[PDB]
């Protein structure tokens, strides 16, 4: 009962470095091929302030789910780069089981989010989602987090 | 360039680094959607300059440099849209290059030569990204090193 998703708002020093090492590892097991996408996941042209307060939260979680869902793909497929995802993963999925225990025009964003992993390459995926990994935790996180004075 | 002026860019600022952030985030978005990546890594996380002599880590970090600030250069005149985010970052990234040459006059040959046969060996799209994911380290951990001098062990 006792959610206090005020939490996540502030993150902290030590997630924030586990998660820029995973990062970093990505980002650098993404040089060495192959070609990426054909459409962009997450547009620098729109952003969760969009919508309704009331409709952050489901944009969010889905986010979370695809991304959570890509870097456990890649943690199996690479056992090196499992090694840095493990913690963050980990972490990645207590913020979104506490999303989704304390929530109780979306959906030509959200639809697109469910032709992914149908639609584009395992590497497009993993580079998506890297890319947007810091925009999800500081900024998308930290938006539905603070409610009603998020515009 | 009338002196040897870096320890300025010890610490930066959160101004510039902003600037370098989202700066980073629409190269990062224009890599997505288009030409690939390397064949080969031209900026090993292995491989430091601390791994280096002090005397030599300005020329590596002047070999780093001058190769990020010409594939931005080139990035910049391809897609405007993309230039008037890169435009301050990429006088900055001038400014320091232009101070650290003042400051100057075994492992380190091969480095500098794979950056200096880059541009001929691998494709624009692995090029923008190389010095992309490479930025940030370059910005605050290879450029603060030399900046410390024997303090950066």
Do not use: M, Y
């Not at 060495?32 to 547009?43: H, M």
């Not at 963050?88 to 989010?113: D, E, F, G, Y």
Request: glycine letters at 2%; hydrophobic letters at 40%.
């Amino acid at each position: 009962r006792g959610c206090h998703i005020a939490q996540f708002k502030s993150l902290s020093p030590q997630e924030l470095q586990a998660f820029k090492r995973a990062k970093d590892a990505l980002e650098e097991s993404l040089l060495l091929k192959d070609c990426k996408c054909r459409s962009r996941l997450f547009p620098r042209t729109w952003d969760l302030r969009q919508l309704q307060v009331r409709e952050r939260p489901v944009a969010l979680e889905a986010e979370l789910a695809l991304t959570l869902k890509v870097l456990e793909a890649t943690a199996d497929t690479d056992p090196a780069l499992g090694d840095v995802l493990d913690q963050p993963l980990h972490t990645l999925h207590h913020i979104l089981s506490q999303l989704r225990a304390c929530i109780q025009r979306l959906h030509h964003w959200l639809h697109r989010l469910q032709e992914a992993p149908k639609k584009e390459s395992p590497g497009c995926l993993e580079a998506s989602v890297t890319f947007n990994l810091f925009r999800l935790l500081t900024r998308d996180l930290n938006c539905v987090a603070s409610g009603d004075l998020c515009v």
